[PDB]
Amino acid sequence: KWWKEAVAYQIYPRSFMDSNGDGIGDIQGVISKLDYLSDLGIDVIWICPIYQSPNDDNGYDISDYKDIMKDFGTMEDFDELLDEVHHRGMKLIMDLVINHTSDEHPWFLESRSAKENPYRDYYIWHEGKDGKEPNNWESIFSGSAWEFDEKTKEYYMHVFSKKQPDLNWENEKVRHELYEMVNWWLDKGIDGFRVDAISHIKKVAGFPDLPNPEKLDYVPSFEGHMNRPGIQEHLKELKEKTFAKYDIMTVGEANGVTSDSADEWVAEDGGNFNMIFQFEHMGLWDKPLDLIELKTILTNWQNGLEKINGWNALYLENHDQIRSVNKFGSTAYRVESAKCLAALYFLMKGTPFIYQGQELGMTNVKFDSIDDYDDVGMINYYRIQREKGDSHDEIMKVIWETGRDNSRTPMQWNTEKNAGFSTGNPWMKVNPNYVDINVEEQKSDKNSVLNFYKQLIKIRKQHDVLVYGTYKLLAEEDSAIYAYTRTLEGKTAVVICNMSPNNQTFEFPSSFTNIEVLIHNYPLDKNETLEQCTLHPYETRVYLIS
Ligand SMILES: [Ca+2]
Numbered sequence: 001k002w003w004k005e006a007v008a009y010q011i012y013p014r015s016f017m018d019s020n021g022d023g024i025g026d027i028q029g030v031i032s033k034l035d036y037l038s039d040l041g042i043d044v045i046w047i048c049p050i051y052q053s054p055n056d057d058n059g060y061d062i063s064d065y066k067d068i069m070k071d072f073g074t075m076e077d078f079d080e081l082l083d084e085v086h087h088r089g090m091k092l093i094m095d096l097v098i099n100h101t102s103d104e105h106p107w108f109l110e111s112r113s114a115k116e117n118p119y120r121d122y123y124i125w126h127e128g129k130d131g132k133e134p135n136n137w138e139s140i141f142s143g144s145a146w147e148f149d150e151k152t153k154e155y156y157m158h159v160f161s162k163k164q165p166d167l168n169w170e171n172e173k174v175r176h177e178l179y180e181m182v183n184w185w186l187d188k189g190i191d192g193f194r195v196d197a198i199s200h201i202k203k204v205a206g207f208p209d210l211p212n213p214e215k216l217d218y219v220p221s222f223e224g225h226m227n228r229p230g231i232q233e234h235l236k237e238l239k240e241k242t243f244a245k246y247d248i249m250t251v252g253e254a255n256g257v258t259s260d261s262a263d264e265w266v267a268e269d270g271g272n273f274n275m276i277f278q279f280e281h282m283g284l285w286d287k288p289l290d291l292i293e294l295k296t297i298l299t300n301w302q303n304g305l306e307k308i309n310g311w312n313a314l315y316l317e318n319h320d321q322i323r324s325v326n327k328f329g330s331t332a333y334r335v336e337s338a339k340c341l342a343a344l345y346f347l348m349k350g351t352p353f354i355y356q357g358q359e360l361g362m363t364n365v366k367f368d369s370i371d372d373y374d375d376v377g378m379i380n381y382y383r384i385q386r387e388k389g390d391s392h393d394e395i396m397k398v399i400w401e402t403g404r405d406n407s408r409t410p411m412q413w414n415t416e417k418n419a420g421f422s423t424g425n426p427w428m429k430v431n432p433n434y435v436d437i438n439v440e441e442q443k444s445d446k447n448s449v450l451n452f453y454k455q456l457i458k459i460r461k462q463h464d465v466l467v468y469g470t471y472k473l474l475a476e477e478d479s480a481i482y483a484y485t486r487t488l489e490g491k492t493a494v495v496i497c498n499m500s501p502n503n504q505t506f507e508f509p510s511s512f513t514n515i516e517v518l519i520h521n522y523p524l525d526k527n528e529t530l531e532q533c534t535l536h537p538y539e540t541r542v543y544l545i546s
Pocket residue numbers: 018019020021022023024025026071
């Protein structure tokens with residue numbers, strides 16, 4: 001229940017803060033900015049993988065689960081981070097990556113050493129078919145989902161990058177070792193896990209070919225390994241052997257789960273996770289804004305989980321997506337839309353997550369060279385598509401509007417060199433607009449995006465209706481206005497958001513003994529009457545009704 005009232009902040013450590021001038025963010029960097037997060041009002045800190053890794057996927061390819069990435073620091077630095085986080089009245093949850101390991105993980109080095117060895121079926125191996133791969137499955141990062149090993153004359157499976165071989169969850173020895181590793185971290189006193197790619201662990205037995213109606217070289221293989229039948233057997237065991245033994249919060253990255261099939265994931269009775277990251281409103285790995293479509297999706301999840309006593313994880317950004325201002329708002333009304341977006345997703349029923357930079361209203365970036373980018377997915381995509389005849393401009397268009405690297409440029413702290421993120425050369429170039437968008441500037445401006453998030457966190461903590469209140473959608477047919485209420489006892493909160501770059505008129509959806517304006521991003525017009533709302537572009541208002 002503490003995780004229900006919590007506000008979470010997601011840190012992408014490589015791009016948060018560098019403290020020793022090598023252009024790479026580190027743990028001591030995070031430690032130096034804990035005041036910032038504490039003063040923001042953050043309850044829970046989720047940190048992206050900080051384990052030993054070759055960084056072919058920036059930490060999500062782990063070669064040692066119990067050692068810290070050398071770039072980030074040592075185990076002592078982590079211990080210091082956890083100790084300092086805990087003394088500031090905050091909690092830390094780690095990223096649990098157990099769908100796959102690095103190909104440099106000792107398990108896999110042994111696994112690939114011979115066709116028969118005790119670690120061979122720790123991963124997924126298969127002989128080829130017709131001098132080619134076992135099947136036509138495409139990796140999520142493009143190319144074949146199978147990599148050939150010359151020594152043992154067989155292919156190993158990787159849903160993601162080549163250096164990320166999938167673990168074999170049908171092997172009980174694999175599960176046992178993972179369970180031991182998980183409990184090892186929980187014994188250290190961490191407060192839970194974000195469970196990475198957990199919906200990809202069950203493969204369709206036999207790994208059959210998928211329908212290829214357009215005769216591609218490789219086929220998008222979601223129907224082969226995402227939320228496949230039988231996955232709940234593993235997840236239920238995972239909970240029973242690890243999570244259920246501790247007072248922690250677990251949030252599973254569960255791509256491919258819909259609002260009607262979310263029961264055995266997040267239901268109060270029998271659910272394997274406290275909450276999940278669902279992607280129906282986001283869309284992973286796709287290559288104005290129908291506001292009503294967004295209404296339907298978010299409302300489905302609100303109504304759907306309320307019915308089974310589930311709990312929603314609320315978010316608009318993360319390290320795998322583009323910036324929300326570009327995706328849902330407007331760059332022509334950056335400051336305003338960022339606040340409008342904030343109030344929109346933050347004040348729904350669930351636990352809100354804040355990704356680094358989101359509270360500043362950071363936007364996408366446009367680098368001209370493919371060499372300026374890092375995402376293994378888009379680098380592969382460039383290479384493949386260019387060979388097929390796509391122009392440089394065509395591919396960069398996709399990368400700019402869609403590439404997740406938009407969310408991995410350094411955190412913008414001030415107006416100094418590299419926005420104060422590093423004294424050296426950042427691993428990824430800083431967004432040029434840092435001279436306008438940074439923490440220092442937004443701290444002293446009471447109308448900044450940063451201070452708006454501070455107000456949101458504060459009013460949510462002060463009003464139980466904003467935490468446990470029932471959600472109801474208002475004015476569904478309005479293509480510009482997203483309005484909804486939160487109701488708890490004699491308290492009704494009315495959240496109004498003008499999701500358009502234009503002025504809009506809107507009748508107040510009225511029966512109250514008291515009304516109060518909890519938050520607003522535009523100055524209040526004195527002549528304006530409550531019933532006739534004249535909303536500016538991306539104006540948002542939250543009324544409290546008694
Ligand atoms: Ca560093």
